[PDB]
From TrEMBL, chain B:
Protein name: Conserved protein
Gene3D superfamilies referenced in this protein's UniProt entry, alphabetically: EhaM-like (1.10.3070.10)
Superkingdom as given in the UniProt entry: Archaea
Amino acid sequence: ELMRLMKRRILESYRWQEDVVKPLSREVEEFQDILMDKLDMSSLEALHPRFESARPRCIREKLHSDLQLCWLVDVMEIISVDDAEALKDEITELVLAGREYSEALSEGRRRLHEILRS
Amino acid sequence: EGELMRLMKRRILESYRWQEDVVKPLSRELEIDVEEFQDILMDKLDMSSLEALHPRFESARPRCIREKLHSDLQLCWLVDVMEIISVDDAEALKDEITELVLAGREYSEALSEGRRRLHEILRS
Protein backbone atom coordinates (compact mmCIF):
# COMPACT_ATOMS: atom_id res chain seq x y z
CA GLU A 1 0.00 0.00 0.00
CA LEU A 2 3.04 2.16 0.71
CA MET A 3 4.05 3.03 -2.87
CA ARG A 4 0.59 4.32 -3.73
CA LEU A 5 1.15 6.65 -0.79
CA MET A 6 4.77 7.62 -1.25
CA LYS A 7 3.84 9.08 -4.63
CA ARG A 8 0.37 10.23 -3.63
CA ARG A 9 2.58 12.31 -1.36
CA ILE A 10 4.54 13.95 -4.19
CA LEU A 11 1.47 14.81 -6.25
CA GLU A 12 0.07 16.35 -3.03
CA SER A 13 3.36 18.24 -2.91
CA TYR A 14 2.90 21.99 -3.07
CA ARG A 15 5.53 22.62 -5.75
CA TRP A 16 3.79 20.04 -7.92
CA GLN A 17 0.20 21.11 -7.28
CA GLU A 18 1.05 24.74 -8.15
CA ASP A 19 3.57 24.14 -10.93
CA VAL A 20 2.13 21.09 -12.68
CA VAL A 21 -1.00 19.33 -11.47
CA LYS A 22 -3.22 22.42 -11.30
CA PRO A 23 -1.51 24.40 -14.12
CA LEU A 24 -2.25 21.64 -16.59
CA SER A 25 -5.88 22.73 -16.44
CA ARG A 26 -5.42 23.47 -20.10
CA GLU A 27 -7.52 20.36 -20.80
CA VAL A 28 -7.68 18.22 -11.51
CA GLU A 29 -8.65 15.35 -9.24
CA GLU A 30 -8.59 12.94 -12.16
CA PHE A 31 -5.38 14.14 -13.78
CA GLN A 32 -3.73 13.34 -10.48
CA ASP A 33 -4.93 9.75 -10.78
CA ILE A 34 -3.84 9.66 -14.40
CA LEU A 35 -0.38 10.68 -13.36
CA MET A 36 -0.62 8.17 -10.50
CA ASP A 37 -1.74 5.69 -13.16
CA LYS A 38 0.94 6.45 -15.77
CA LEU A 39 4.22 7.49 -14.13
CA ASP A 40 6.17 5.17 -11.86
CA MET A 41 8.01 6.07 -8.64
CA SER A 42 11.48 6.73 -10.03
CA SER A 43 9.82 9.00 -12.56
CA LEU A 44 7.95 11.00 -9.93
CA GLU A 45 11.08 11.60 -7.89
CA ALA A 46 12.86 13.13 -10.89
CA LEU A 47 10.28 15.08 -12.90
CA HIS A 48 9.93 18.45 -11.09
CA PRO A 49 13.60 19.43 -11.73
CA ARG A 50 13.50 18.39 -15.35
CA PHE A 51 10.15 20.22 -15.36
CA GLU A 52 11.55 23.54 -14.22
CA SER A 53 14.39 23.35 -16.77
CA ALA A 54 11.88 22.98 -19.63
CA ARG A 55 9.11 25.34 -18.49
CA PRO A 56 10.78 28.12 -20.59
CA ARG A 57 11.16 25.99 -23.69
CA CYS A 58 7.55 24.84 -23.49
CA ILE A 59 6.33 28.37 -23.22
CA ARG A 60 8.37 29.72 -26.11
CA GLU A 61 6.84 26.91 -28.14
CA LYS A 62 3.36 27.92 -27.04
CA LEU A 63 4.19 31.53 -27.87
CA HIS A 64 5.64 30.74 -31.30
CA SER A 65 2.40 28.93 -31.97
CA ASP A 66 -0.14 31.31 -30.51
CA LEU A 67 1.65 34.20 -32.22
CA GLN A 68 1.10 32.61 -35.64
CA LEU A 69 4.86 32.65 -36.02
CA CYS A 70 4.87 29.51 -38.18
CA TRP A 71 3.45 31.71 -40.92
CA LEU A 72 4.82 35.13 -40.09
CA VAL A 73 8.33 33.71 -40.01
CA ASP A 74 9.02 30.16 -41.15
CA VAL A 75 6.72 30.61 -44.16
CA MET A 76 5.98 34.19 -45.13
CA GLU A 77 9.09 35.72 -43.53
CA ILE A 78 7.24 38.95 -42.80
CA ILE A 79 9.10 38.97 -39.49
CA SER A 80 12.84 38.60 -39.02
CA VAL A 81 14.03 35.64 -36.98
CA ASP A 82 15.86 38.13 -34.81
CA ASP A 83 12.75 40.09 -34.10
CA ALA A 84 10.86 36.86 -33.40
CA GLU A 85 13.40 35.28 -31.08
CA ALA A 86 13.67 38.55 -29.20
CA LEU A 87 9.90 38.83 -28.76
CA LYS A 88 9.67 35.24 -27.60
CA ASP A 89 12.39 36.02 -25.05
CA GLU A 90 10.72 39.06 -23.51
CA ILE A 91 7.32 37.47 -23.18
CA THR A 92 8.73 34.21 -21.85
CA GLU A 93 10.73 36.40 -19.45
CA LEU A 94 7.43 37.80 -18.23
CA VAL A 95 5.50 34.58 -17.91
CA LEU A 96 8.47 33.08 -16.05
CA ALA A 97 8.20 35.93 -13.55
CA GLY A 98 4.60 35.21 -12.61
CA ARG A 99 2.86 36.96 -15.51
CA GLU A 100 -0.32 35.11 -16.50
CA TYR A 101 0.33 33.42 -19.88
CA SER A 102 -3.10 34.62 -20.94
CA GLU A 103 -2.26 38.20 -20.09
CA ALA A 104 1.33 37.86 -21.32
CA LEU A 105 0.26 36.55 -24.71
CA SER A 106 -1.91 39.66 -25.09
CA GLU A 107 1.16 41.83 -24.53
CA GLY A 108 3.10 39.74 -27.05
CA ARG A 109 0.36 40.22 -29.63
CA ARG A 110 0.71 43.92 -28.92
CA ARG A 111 4.47 44.08 -29.46
CA LEU A 112 3.97 41.87 -32.49
CA HIS A 113 1.48 44.19 -34.17
CA GLU A 114 3.99 46.91 -33.45
CA ILE A 115 6.72 45.06 -35.38
CA LEU A 116 4.41 44.21 -38.27
CA ARG A 117 3.53 47.87 -38.67
CA SER A 118 7.16 48.89 -38.91
CA GLU B 1 5.36 56.26 -60.65
CA GLY B 2 5.86 52.59 -59.78
CA GLU B 3 2.09 52.55 -59.44
CA LEU B 4 1.72 49.42 -61.57
CA MET B 5 3.54 47.22 -59.06
CA ARG B 6 1.28 48.42 -56.20
CA LEU B 7 -1.60 47.20 -58.35
CA MET B 8 -0.07 43.97 -59.62
CA LYS B 9 0.26 42.74 -56.03
CA ARG B 10 -2.85 44.41 -54.69
CA ARG B 11 -4.30 42.07 -57.29
CA ILE B 12 -2.85 38.96 -55.66
CA LEU B 13 -3.82 39.87 -52.15
CA GLU B 14 -7.30 40.45 -53.56
CA SER B 15 -7.05 37.00 -55.08
CA TYR B 16 -9.63 34.50 -53.87
CA ARG B 17 -7.34 31.67 -52.84
CA TRP B 18 -5.37 34.22 -50.85
CA GLN B 19 -8.25 35.98 -49.14
CA GLU B 20 -9.70 32.65 -48.10
CA ASP B 21 -6.51 30.77 -47.16
CA VAL B 22 -4.24 33.50 -45.85
CA VAL B 23 -5.30 37.11 -45.49
CA LYS B 24 -8.61 36.30 -43.80
CA PRO B 25 -7.60 33.12 -41.88
CA LEU B 26 -4.69 34.98 -40.25
CA SER B 27 -7.33 36.63 -38.06
CA ARG B 28 -5.61 34.96 -35.13
CA GLU B 29 -4.01 38.33 -34.23
CA LEU B 30 -7.15 40.09 -33.18
CA GLU B 31 -6.46 40.24 -36.97
CA ILE B 32 -6.17 44.02 -36.61
CA ASP B 33 -8.82 44.09 -39.30
CA VAL B 34 -7.92 42.21 -42.44
CA GLU B 35 -7.71 45.55 -44.19
CA GLU B 36 -4.56 46.47 -42.32
CA PHE B 37 -2.87 43.09 -42.53
CA GLN B 38 -3.22 43.32 -46.27
CA ASP B 39 -1.32 46.62 -46.23
CA ILE B 40 1.28 45.06 -43.96
CA LEU B 41 1.80 42.29 -46.47
CA MET B 42 1.80 44.96 -49.16
CA ASP B 43 4.37 46.78 -47.07
CA LYS B 44 6.62 43.84 -46.23
CA LEU B 45 6.60 41.20 -48.98
CA ASP B 46 7.97 42.12 -52.43
CA MET B 47 6.56 41.09 -55.80
CA SER B 48 8.66 37.96 -56.39
CA SER B 49 7.71 36.83 -52.91
CA LEU B 50 4.00 37.24 -53.53
CA GLU B 51 3.99 35.28 -56.79
CA ALA B 52 5.67 32.42 -54.93
CA LEU B 53 3.98 32.33 -51.51
CA HIS B 54 0.73 30.42 -51.93
CA PRO B 55 2.12 27.12 -53.21
CA ARG B 56 4.77 27.36 -50.49
CA PHE B 57 1.94 28.15 -48.14
CA GLU B 58 -0.12 25.10 -49.13
CA SER B 59 2.83 22.78 -48.59
CA ALA B 60 3.37 23.99 -45.04
CA ARG B 61 -0.23 24.36 -43.96
CA PRO B 62 0.01 20.77 -42.57
CA ARG B 63 3.33 21.19 -40.77
CA CYS B 64 2.12 24.43 -39.22
CA ILE B 65 -1.04 22.80 -37.96
CA ARG B 66 0.75 19.92 -36.29
CA GLU B 67 2.85 22.49 -34.49
CA LYS B 68 -0.28 24.32 -33.29
CA LEU B 69 -1.79 20.99 -32.22
CA HIS B 70 1.29 19.82 -30.39
CA SER B 71 1.22 23.08 -28.48
CA ASP B 72 -2.48 23.43 -27.83
CA LEU B 73 -2.58 19.80 -26.68
CA GLN B 74 0.08 20.42 -24.05
CA LEU B 75 2.28 17.85 -25.75
CA CYS B 76 5.50 19.62 -24.89
CA TRP B 77 4.73 18.34 -21.41
CA LEU B 78 2.74 15.21 -21.94
CA VAL B 79 5.44 13.88 -24.20
CA ASP B 80 8.77 15.67 -24.51
CA VAL B 81 8.90 16.23 -20.74
CA MET B 82 6.79 13.87 -18.67
CA GLU B 83 6.44 11.13 -21.30
CA ILE B 84 2.92 10.35 -20.10
CA ILE B 85 2.13 9.74 -23.78
CA SER B 86 4.03 7.64 -26.30
CA VAL B 87 5.46 9.43 -29.29
CA ASP B 88 3.67 6.89 -31.43
CA ASP B 89 0.37 7.84 -29.81
CA ALA B 90 1.19 11.54 -30.12
CA GLU B 91 2.11 11.48 -33.79
CA ALA B 92 -0.93 9.38 -34.67
CA LEU B 93 -3.20 11.81 -32.85
CA LYS B 94 -1.67 14.81 -34.55
CA ASP B 95 -2.13 13.04 -37.87
CA GLU B 96 -5.85 12.40 -37.60
CA ILE B 97 -6.67 15.85 -36.20
CA THR B 98 -4.58 17.45 -38.91
CA GLU B 99 -6.25 15.20 -41.42
CA LEU B 100 -9.50 16.77 -40.28
CA VAL B 101 -8.57 20.42 -40.28
CA LEU B 102 -6.97 19.90 -43.67
CA ALA B 103 -10.29 18.62 -44.91
CA GLY B 104 -12.11 21.78 -43.87
CA ARG B 105 -12.69 21.03 -40.19
CA GLU B 106 -12.67 24.25 -38.15
CA TYR B 107 -9.45 24.23 -36.10
CA SER B 108 -11.38 25.35 -33.07
CA GLU B 109 -13.81 22.50 -33.42
CA ALA B 110 -11.06 20.08 -34.50
CA LEU B 111 -8.89 20.84 -31.45
CA SER B 112 -11.83 19.97 -29.19
CA GLU B 113 -12.07 16.53 -30.77
CA GLY B 114 -8.31 16.14 -30.30
CA ARG B 115 -8.71 17.09 -26.66
CA ARG B 116 -11.27 14.29 -26.48
CA ARG B 117 -9.20 11.53 -28.07
CA LEU B 118 -6.33 12.75 -25.89
CA HIS B 119 -8.21 12.35 -22.61
CA GLU B 120 -9.08 8.95 -23.96
CA ILE B 121 -5.43 8.03 -24.35
CA LEU B 122 -4.51 9.45 -20.97
CA ARG B 123 -7.20 7.30 -19.39
CA SER B 124 -5.79 4.03 -20.78
